[PDB]
């Protein structure tokens, strides 16, 4: 269980720890991937701006995953948000992409 | 009155309704197959279809 | 007396055994100002029991 409560009147929204506490959207987190697969639309709609700008880091546990490699010229600016957001949108309850 | 009823037959009509409510629950539940779950909401659970 | 009607004893239900349904009466205010509509599970078309 991880139930998200919004913060009224400027308070930060909070998600429930396994121990029972409720933390703001900061720090280092550990998910299992089935958690994210349960309600991925609500989860990424809550988490997109916090991953993109805030100091939120999430460790999602798999064990196994197939991967895909994209290369960039290191002497040129390169941002990976289009690819990362594409993966986090194309994930679904029944499957994952690479 | 269409919208009215005599209060002196409430017990008789309610227990006749209980009789019909019992007589419509005289059936047996029939086995209708299962399917192993593939989405991780319930791990390893078999759901009746 | 010579040949009577037989009753239908065995009857089988393939659905689910219940008699008490749950019905909504007044709709919840899903567009409201104090809470944004991104809270509710009705906005994402998540069906609920």
């Amino acid at each position: 269980d991880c139930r998200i409560s919004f913060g009224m009147n400027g308070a930060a929204p909070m998600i429930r720890d396994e121990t029972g506490m409720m933390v703001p959207f900061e720090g280092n987190w550990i998910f299992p991937l089935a958690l994210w697969q349960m309600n991925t639309r609500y989860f990424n709609q809550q988490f997109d701006a916090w991953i993109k700008t805030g100091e939120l880091r999430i460790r999602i546990e798999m064990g196994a995953y197939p991967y895909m490699l994209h290369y960039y010229d290191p002497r040129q600016y390169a941002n990976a948000w289009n690819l990362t957001s594409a993966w986090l949108e194309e994930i679904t309850p029944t499957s994952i992409p690479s | 009155s269409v919208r009215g009823a005599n209060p002196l037959m409430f017990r008789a009509n309610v227990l006749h309704m209980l009789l019909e409510f019992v007589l419509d629950n005289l059936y047996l539940n029939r086995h209708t197959g299962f399917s192993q779950d593939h989405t991780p909401f319930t791990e390893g659970a078999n759901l009746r279809s | 007396l010579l040949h009577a009607d037989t009753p239908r004893l065995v009857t089988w239900d393939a659905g689910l055994c219940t008699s008490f349904k749950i019905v909504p009466i007044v709709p919840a205010q899903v567009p409201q100002d104090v809470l944004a509509y991104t809270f509710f599970t009705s906005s994402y078309a998540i069906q609920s029991p």
Binding site: - | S35, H38, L47 | Y37, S43, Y44, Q47
Partner: peptide, 19 residues
Amino acid sequence: PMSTRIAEATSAIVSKHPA
């Protein structure tokens, strides 16, 4: 058939984008 039963039991729980 089992393919339609599995597809139905996983198409019961989906979710779409908000408007």
